[PDB]
Amino acid sequence: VEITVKELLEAGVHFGHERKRWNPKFARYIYAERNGIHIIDLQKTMEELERTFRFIEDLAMRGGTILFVGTKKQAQDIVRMEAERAGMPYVNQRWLGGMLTNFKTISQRVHRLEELEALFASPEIEERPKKEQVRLKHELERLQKYLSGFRLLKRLPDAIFVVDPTKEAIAVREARKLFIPVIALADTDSDPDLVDYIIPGNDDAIRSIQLILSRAVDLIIQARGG
RNA sequence: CGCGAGGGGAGCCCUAGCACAGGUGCUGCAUGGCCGUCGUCAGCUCGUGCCGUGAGGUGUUGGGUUAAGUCCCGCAACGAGCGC
Numbered sequence: 001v002e003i004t005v006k007e008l009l010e011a012g013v014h015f016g017h018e019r020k021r022w023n024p025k026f027a028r029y030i031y032a033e034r035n036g037i038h039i040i041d042l043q044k045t046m047e048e049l050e051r052t053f054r055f056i057e058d059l060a061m062r063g064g065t066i067l068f069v070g071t072k073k074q075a076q077d078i079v080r081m082e083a084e085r086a087g088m089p090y091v092n093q094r095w096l097g098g099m100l101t102n103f104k105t106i107s108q109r110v111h112r113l114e115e116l117e118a119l120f121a122s123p124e125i126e127e128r129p130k131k132e133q134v135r136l137k138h139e140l141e142r143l144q145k146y147l148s149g150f151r152l153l154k155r156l157p158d159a160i161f162v163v164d165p166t167k168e169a170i171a172v173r174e175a176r177k178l179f180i181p182v183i184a185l186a187d188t189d190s191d192p193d194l195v196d197y198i199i200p201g202n203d204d205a206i207r208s209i210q211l212i213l214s215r216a217v218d219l220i221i222q223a224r225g226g
Numbered sequence: 227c228g229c230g231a232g233g234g235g236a237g238c239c240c241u242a243g244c245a246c247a248g249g250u251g252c253u254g255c256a257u258g259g260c261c262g263u264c265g266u267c268a269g270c271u272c273g274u275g276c277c278g279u280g281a282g283g284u285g286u287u288g289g290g291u292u293a294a295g296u297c298c299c300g301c302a303a304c305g306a307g308c309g310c
């Protein structure tokens with residue numbers, strides 16, 4: 001499906017961030033300062049949204065596995081129910097320095113979760129002395145917390161998808177190294193040369209987030225028939 | 227072995243000689259092992275990654291908690307080995 005100027009506005013996509021927390025390189029992308037706090041030119045989001053949906057549509061036509069990254073406390077459970085719909089892997093909880101330049105060292109920890117789900121199915125768990133029982137219990141949920149999106153990541157992703165290229169300019173800097181392409185949603189407080197496929201729009205607007213994912217995760221499934 | 231007096235042989239015994247035995251002679255500052263001790267103190271480290279040109283750091287630190295590196299939260303870390 002398609003998208004217009006009309007729809008983006010109501011979301012708060014022109015609604016940039018401050019001038020006091022501000023990245024100069026973000027130049028090209030603005031209108032002005034109606035009350036000191038910037039206004040994004042959406043006739044230059046129509047530019048970097050076309051191109052940055054084409055690139056997503058190709059990847060769902062050559063069936064790509066796209067990471068989802070949002071840790072900003074509003075983002076999270078919208079990263080979530082917008083990756084789940086997509087069939088995806090998502091880091092909603094808290095990124096780990098490694099999870100890309102160390103996928104092994106990390107992924108020795110998935111299997112330790114997948115082993116522990118199955119350990120808890122069987123009866124042999126109850127046999128272990130109940131000190132370990134509650135103890136080794138704790139470790140189950142720890143892993144379900146910070147990974148219930150990582151699990152379905154069995155290898156390294158074809159593109160990572162950020163909502164804040166400055167909070168997780170960590171993540172972005174991993175897929176920098178291991179030549180993955182980057183797909184970011186960025187306001188003004190964010191270096192925009194550190195992204196190949198980029199959306200200028202709101203960082204923290206729980207309705208700007210909301211439209212953009214739920215319109216991305218369409219030109220995923222539509223491009224994977226369904 | 228022999229019919230036989232009795233010679234040969236193994237053991238052990240003595241005398242003489244030789245291998246050598248034996249030493250609580252030395253050095254714990256040439257060692258083994260075992261012991262004491264800082265100390266039953268919560269500490270000591272490695273892997274992969276991250277960060278510095280590097281020695282190195284990160285991890286193990288900060289805040290909360292614990293008889294404890296015990297654990298909870300945070301963090302460029304994630305776990306494991308010897309301790310608890």
Ligand SMILES: C[NH+](C)c1cc(NC(=O)CNC(C)(C)C)c(O)c2c1C[C@H]1C[C@H]3[C@H]([NH+](C)C)C(O)=C(C(N)=O)C(=O)[C@@]3(O)C(O)=C1C2=O
Nearest residue numbers: 250251252253254255256257258259260261262263264265
């Ligand atoms: C006197 N100094 C030159 C000395 C010499 C030797 N060894 C030699 O000279 C042997 N060298 C050869 C190899 C034979 C040429 C030594 O072997 C020693 C010492 C130092 C002592 C000191 C001792 C001391 N108290 C118990 C008398 C002491 O307070 C301690 C301590 N740190 O608490 C010791 O270490 C001590 O007992 C000690 O070990 C010494 C020597 O071993």
Ligand SMILES: [Mg+2]
Nearest residue numbers: 254255257261
């Ligand atoms: Mg000594």
Ligand SMILES: [Mg+2]
Nearest residue numbers: 252253254255
């Ligand atoms: Mg002495």
Ligand SMILES: [Mg+2]
Nearest residue numbers: 253254255256
């Ligand atoms: Mg001495």
Ligand SMILES: [Mg+2]
Nearest residue numbers: 266293294310
């Ligand atoms: Mg103790």
Ligand SMILES: [Mg+2]
Nearest residue numbers: 276277278279
């Ligand atoms: Mg280096």
Ligand SMILES: [Mg+2]
Nearest residue numbers: 285301303304
């Ligand atoms: Mg930790």
Ligand SMILES: [Mg+2]
Nearest residue numbers: 269270271286
């Ligand atoms: Mg230490």
Ligand SMILES: [Mg+2]
Nearest residue numbers: 284286287288
């Ligand atoms: Mg520190």
Ligand SMILES: [Mg+2]
Nearest residue numbers: 295296309310
């Ligand atoms: Mg421990």
